[PDB]
């Protein structure tokens, strides 16, 4: 109805905050939450930074694939 | 900046949306004489659009890349007016309605023919019961403590 | 013959719902009582078995119907006087879109007040009232205000009459059973005098005002209608034959009236409609014919016919006693008369819908495409619904009022003794038509997909020419001068004379060619109509008994089944045959309106240039694209739905919203149609459990809907959704282009 | 009239009156304070 | 043929045996109810499975029960 009356700025658009936080916790940096694997000084980051984190972080922060796509309302 | 969002007042796309809407409204006004009533209506519409955009700018909303406001419902204090306060008000009102209905249903349960009081409402009794729901949280909580809320 | 004060006027019965029924008046033990209250409200036969009481009840409700209609007309006339741009449209009909509704600005809904021309902002209407008012000589809003006031007064009069003829003086049964007098009065007085009065109005008001308007005179400079009556010199200037008065009429010198009573035929080049002189002559002749026809049946003076005597004398070696006994059935049963009248009225509505598009009777109506499309579709749907109701009430009569011990009729008895042959033959005809109509479309689709266009049924590979309709067109095109010497032009421009009428740069009407696609679509129409007639006639003929359930008449007219036995007996009642025929009526009418829309947009409607070249709306793609189902899906539904799906943000966004809303409503009906009662009754038991836990269980026990109620809800929602979707699609497509 | 008062207490009439008053109140509330997306107080 | 069974909650109302569209059911004398009667089902080869008898029983849950079973020419109601 809001789109029909030509006023798209009245829509109810809710951010999926929890899923974005979970994505950030896996090493994604497009939301700026900076938690766990997205934190460079965390124990979790330091534990696996020499085994698998470099390649996984390279793959997750590249937007041409389907690994943890960006999400919205 | 939660989730990489930006305030509405600094968003350029928000201003572009406002300009496009106002320009679309203004192109219709050139078809009418300034003194005519449709011109007055279009003037009022333009003023209302400007006021709405200004008000959205003032309240501290957050815009995306499309210039559209987004709502934060995670419980942050900076956005409690988006979800929390209307939610509490709605819960109060819904509890009022439910409590009044339950009270009326209990009131007429002891009559000879309780069904006939459901198709033809007893107006004075309902009117007396209507005011009582204004304090529904206290009554409901005390009934829960006394164990009278749940049927045995 | 009436009774003085038969029923007291009181508010007592208002406070006791269900007073009309003994069972319903007890009280609401369950929620089924509430639904039972509304379904049986107007079934006067079930209320009482006295025919006089039923007749008295029926007579009074028609007064309420007339009052509601008069209120609707009063509103329609008032809105044109107060919230319309009629006076601006009257000065430039071709460039201004009619509008008579405006909207309050509340939640941003003022966007619906788009521009329509004449310095006005509102909703464009497609009912055609502007052309009706223009053809009547109406010029100012004062006349419309007076008409609205008069309609309000007439509505009040109808309501008072309805109260009076039921509470103060109710006619006796002998008054109702006087069919000869009723027929005489309804023929001579209701129709003949009405036609004569309208002819007089057209002679004295419409002709001079419309002549002045067509001449180009400013509507504010035209003399008032009463000035043509008090000043015969003005009419003499317009029509010299008026100087002789009524002397030519009484001396049988009727040829002098040839100036305003013509037999021209065709369309008026200025306005694109029929000549008004032809309409006046038509109404005069029709009034004479109906006045003569109203003196046929016998009354207190001995001269005339007896309907029973006419009926009793028509019998043959194949029919036995013939029509003897039909007079007593039609004077004692309200349902049979209702069924007959419903069928005739539906057929008449369909005929009217077909006739108004090919012979446009109103000025500036042919070039208003949206009005034409809307009127055609509206009247087609009304006719279909009335036709289905006819069969419904025929089945009701068969179940209830059939009694051979006192109302024997040989013609009805003989039909019931060979119903198997009728049903089997109709079944075979339906199967044959379905195979040889829809199968040709599948053949075309397969041949086109396989890459073999030379093996299709089309105008280029394998022609199926409708040579019978083309012969009729040729006969009607050459009628003037051979078989109709008194006519100047043909009855319609569609017969194929070769002339074109253009009004304001648009095409009004022109010859309509027929080819291979028309053959296929006409046989599709025949197939659908035959299937609908099969479902309704099977339902009527097997209402009382069959080989499956010999005692079906004892179970009533509206019952769900006779249990899971005999392999299963779901949907055996006559009500279920109407429920199933509604779906086929919907299918047939949808196909018909789609055919009309595509054919009009492809071969008729368009714009005309200075050099005389016509550009149609869709460019004449009907002939080659409609011969396949893929063509209908692509070039009709996909292409023409772009207007309705792009209407957001403009004045047509209401149609876009209604499109999705009607989609939702249509899809919502499938829940009631595909499921059964037991599941929902079991589900409610669990919901009631938690209401008992919190002491909120109602004293009126909740029940699931009955089997019949669920069927009715499903069919109602299904029809509403489908028709509303098509309505929004049509209006959004045709207003823009 | 007692019977007239009884007819005014039947479910459909009472529901219609209640919903009409409710719709009027909501329409006026949205007319005085248009385009509310957040509770600012 | 279908299966029709009677249980001792029967009150002797006769309403089931009056409702049957084919003669399947009949009353016999008994002791155990005020009416001193019970329904019997001797002719279940002629049962069509309509359940008219179960719609007529006034007991809380039915004292007559019909279980659909192997179908024959008689139980299908075929007059071909
Ligand atoms: C029965 C047919 C019919 C229909 C469908 C309508 C429909 C409408 N009328 Mg209306 N009207 C009718 C008959 C009808 N009228 C008659 C017979 C008269 C008296 C001659 C009027 C006199 C009338 C006036 C004076 C006005 C309307 C208005 C309206 C519009 C708003 C209604 C409203 O807000 O009511 C709200 C509901 C109430 C119960 C009040 C609506 C489109 C209004 C309008 O168009 O505003 C711009 C308006 O001002 N009508
Ligand atoms: C205001 C005066 C008045 C009063 C007090 C009555 C009182 C009565 N009438 Mg009555 N009647 C009136 C005017 C009145 N009538 C008029 C003007 C007509 C002509 C149409 C009739 C035609 C009429 C018939 C044909 C019958 C009665 C009957 C009755 C009696 C029982 C029905 C009843 O009241 O149930 C409660 C009735 C209602 C609550 C009325 C609901 C009817 C609706 C509201 C009519 C409005 C049409 C439509 C719904 C409105 C617009 C359309 C759209 C919105 C849907 C009752 C004593 C019946 C009777 O005596 O049988 C025993 C009967 O058969 N009346
Ligand atoms: C019921 C319809 C009706 C009514 C009420 C009238 C009424 C009238 N006509 Mg009339 N008229 C009618 C139908 C009617 N006409 C038809 C159908 C024709 C076509 C034959 C005419 C042809 C006609 C002529 C030629 C004249 C009238 C005239 C008149 C007026 C004087 C008598 C009178 C107002 C006369 C007039 O205008 O004098 C004032 C006059 O000269 N009428
Ligand atoms: C002049 C036309 C006419 C007349 C006088 C009648 C008269 C009658 N019909 Mg009938 N009928 C007609 C045309 C007509 N019919 C047509 C054209 C059809 C085919 C569709 C039918 C199909 C039909 C059936 C299938 C049945 C009847 C029955 C009856 C009888 C009882 C009607 C009743 O209680 O209504 C009660 C009225 C209603 C329940 C109102 C229905 C409302 C409609 C369906 C939905 C409207 C939607 C609305 C816009 C939404 C707003 C809702 C609002 C609350 C917000 C009565 C004698 C019944 C009968 O005789 O049973 C033995 C019966 O079973 N008729
Ligand atoms: C799109 C779905 C669909 C289709 C195809 C049909 C088709 C049909 N319905 Mg029907 N119906 C439908 C939906 C449909 N219905 C719905 C939704 C309802 C509402 C519940 C009904 C309600 C209904 C009723 C109430 C009745 C029918 C009847 C009929 C039949 C009409 C007689 C006939 O021969 O038609 C022509 C047949 C066709 C067009 C189907 C053939 C399709 C083409 C020709 C392919 C042929 C392939 C060919 C044989 C080779 C294949 C071989 C194989 C190895 C591949 C026909 C079979 C009537 C009936 O029983 O017959 C009189 C009837 O009374 N229908
Ligand atoms: C079989 C089809 C058919 C039909 C429907 C008509 C219909 C008509 N003819 Mg007609 N006519 C026909 C065949 C037909 N004709 C044939 C075969 C001939 C011989 C060639 C004529 C010769 C004829 C003449 C000479 C006249 C009519 C006229 C008329 C019209 C008025 C006749 C009347 O009584 O009123 C009417 C439209 C009359 C007319 O022109 O009315 C305007 C008239 O003068 N017809
Ligand atoms: C005062 C009345 C009342 C109360 C207190 C409840 C309370 C409850 N219902 Mg409920 N219900 C009601 C009326 C009521 N219902 C009515 C009238 C219907 C039929 C439409 C339903 C249909 C319904 C379903 C289908 C379900 C519930 C469920 C529930 C429970 C979950 C909470 C909830 O909001 O569900 C949501 C409840 C609704 C959406 C109901 C609609 C609200 C109606 C419109 C309120 C009507 C109030 C009534 C008019 C009071 C008039 C007062 C006046 C006389 C003074 C909760 C115990 C759920 C549950 O737990 O299952 C057991 C569930 O699945 N209800
Ligand atoms: C065109 C003149 C006009 C004007 C100026 C108003 C003005 C008002 N109406 Mg109103 N109204 C009008 C016509 C008008 N109405 C018409 C024609 C109808 C239909 C009959 C209504 C039906 C209506 C309803 C149903 C309600 C209003 C209410 C209100 C008030 C809303 C403010 C509020 O809630 O604060 C509180 C109120 C005040 C400060 C003063 C009252 C406001 C004073 C609302 C109201 O009074 O709220 C309590 C309300 O509920 N109006
Ligand atoms: C549960 C679903 C839901 C929810 C939470 C909302 C919530 C809201 N709607 Mg809403 N609406 C809904 C369904 C819903 N709507 C539906 C289904 C429709 C169609 C009938 C509408 C039509 C609608 C309109 C026309 C308007 C709202 C408006 C509003 C806002 C109300 C502002 C105020 O003070 O009141 C609020 C955010 C208003 C607004 O300005 O929103 C910003 C407004 O003008 N709504
Ligand atoms: C067969 C030819 C058409 C029929 C025909 O000859 O019509 C006329 C024919 C004989 O009618 P009668 O002269 O017997 O009766 C005339 C009637 O007016 C008596 O009510 O009708 C029948 O025999 C019944 C036809 C039923 C329908 C048959 C299938 C079509």
UniProtKB/Swiss-Prot annotation, chain A:
Stretch of the intact protein here: 442 to 514 of 734
Function: PsaA and PsaB bind P700, the primary electron donor of photosystem I (PSI), as well as the electron acceptors A0, A1 and FX. PSI is a plastocyanin-ferredoxin oxidoreductase, converting photonic excitation into a charge separation, which transfers an electron from the donor P700 chlorophyll pair to the spectroscopically characterized acceptors A0, A1, FX, FA and FB in turn. Oxidized P700 is reduced on the lumenal side of the thylakoid membrane by plastocyanin.
Subunit structure, as described in the record: The PsaA/B heterodimer binds the P700 chlorophyll special pair and subsequent electron acceptors. PSI consists of a core antenna complex that captures photons, and an electron transfer chain that converts photonic excitation into a charge separation. The eukaryotic PSI reaction center is composed of at least 11 subunits.
Subcellular location: Plastid, Chloroplast thylakoid membrane
Gene: psaB
Name of the protein in its database record: Photosystem I P700 chlorophyll a apoprotein A2
Family per record: Belongs to the PsaA/PsaB family.
Domain of life, source organism: Eukaryota
Paired cysteines (S-S): none
From Swiss-Prot, chain B:
Molecular functions (GO terms): mRNA binding; protein domain specific binding
Compartments where found: Plastid, Chloroplast thylakoid membrane
Swiss-Prot/TrEMBL GO biological process terms: photosynthesis
Signal peptide boundaries: none
TM ranges: 80-100
Further information: Plants lacking PSAF have altered thylakoid structure and are not viable.
Family: Belongs to the PsaF family.
Record-given protein name: Photosystem I reaction center subunit III, chloroplastic
Organism: Arabidopsis thaliana
Swiss-Prot record, chain D:
InterPro entries hit by this protein: PSI_PsaJ (IPR002615), PSI_PsaJ_sf (IPR036062)
HAMAP family per UniProt: PSI_PsaJ (MF_00522)
Cellular compartments per GO CC: chloroplast thylakoid membrane; photosystem I
TM region positions: 7-27
Function: May help in the organization of the PsaE and PsaF subunits.
Subcellular location: Plastid, Chloroplast thylakoid membrane
Family: Belongs to the PsaJ family.
Recorded topology in the membrane: Single-pass membrane protein
Protein name: Photosystem I reaction center subunit IX
One protein family per Pfam: PSI_PsaJ
GO terms for biological process, alphabetical: photosynthesis
Alphabetically ordered keywords of this record: Chloroplast, Membrane, Photosynthesis, Photosystem I, Plastid, Thylakoid, Transmembrane, Transmembrane helix
Chief place where the protein resides: plastid
From Swiss-Prot, chain E:
Swiss-Prot/TrEMBL GO biological process terms: photosynthesis; photosynthetic electron transport in photosystem I
Subcellular location: Plastid, Chloroplast thylakoid membrane
The protein's enzyme class: oxidoreductase
Catalytic activity: reduced [plastocyanin] + hnu + oxidized [2Fe-2S]-[ferredoxin] = oxidized [plastocyanin] + reduced [2Fe-2S]-[ferredoxin]
One Pfam family here: Fer4_21
Binding, [4Fe-4S] cluster 2: 20, 47, 50, 53
UniProt cofactor note: Binds 2 [4Fe-4S] clusters. Cluster 2 is most probably the spectroscopically characterized electron acceptor FA and cluster 1 is most probably FB.
Keyword Cell cycle: no
Single GO MF descriptor: electron transfer activity
Function: Apoprotein for the two 4Fe-4S centers FA and FB of photosystem I (PSI); essential for photochemical activity. FB is the terminal electron acceptor of PSI, donating electrons to ferredoxin. The C-terminus interacts with PsaA/B/D and helps assemble the protein into the PSI complex. Required for binding of PsaD and PsaE to PSI. PSI is a plastocyanin-ferredoxin oxidoreductase, converting photonic excitation into a charge separation, which transfers an electron from the donor P700 chlorophyll pair to the spectroscopically characterized acceptors A0, A1, FX, FA and FB in turn.
Official protein name in the record: Photosystem I iron-sulfur center
